[PDB]
Design a protein around this ligand. Sequence first.
Ligand code: NA
Length: 129
Amino acid sequence: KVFGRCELAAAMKRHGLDNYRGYSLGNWVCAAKFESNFNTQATNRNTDGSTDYGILQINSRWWCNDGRTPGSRNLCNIPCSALLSSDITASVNCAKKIVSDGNGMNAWVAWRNRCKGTDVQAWIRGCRL
Ligand code: NA
């Protein structure tokens, strides 16, 4: 599913992301935009052989099982296919683990390069929240 901006904000808020580990809701929407274009089915293969999946481009080396990533962990205890669904639950609950890990939202490179330090409340402006 390709979300609308405010539709995703609302969904993110419903799953408890607004101010999760202190990151305002706009940070999460911004990260989603630039990681996936709001497209739950987004997949991208990396040079190391891991793949990143879903709206929040969660990585196979550490967080989900895809069967083709050697020596990898599955720290979210999910098949990576769970991360492509129109229901964002598994993506959100895995992302809560990731942001907890110690580097905060810096884990999402596109957050660090395109959202960190910017006016991220613009991402939620206009929405009925
Ligand atoms: Na894995």
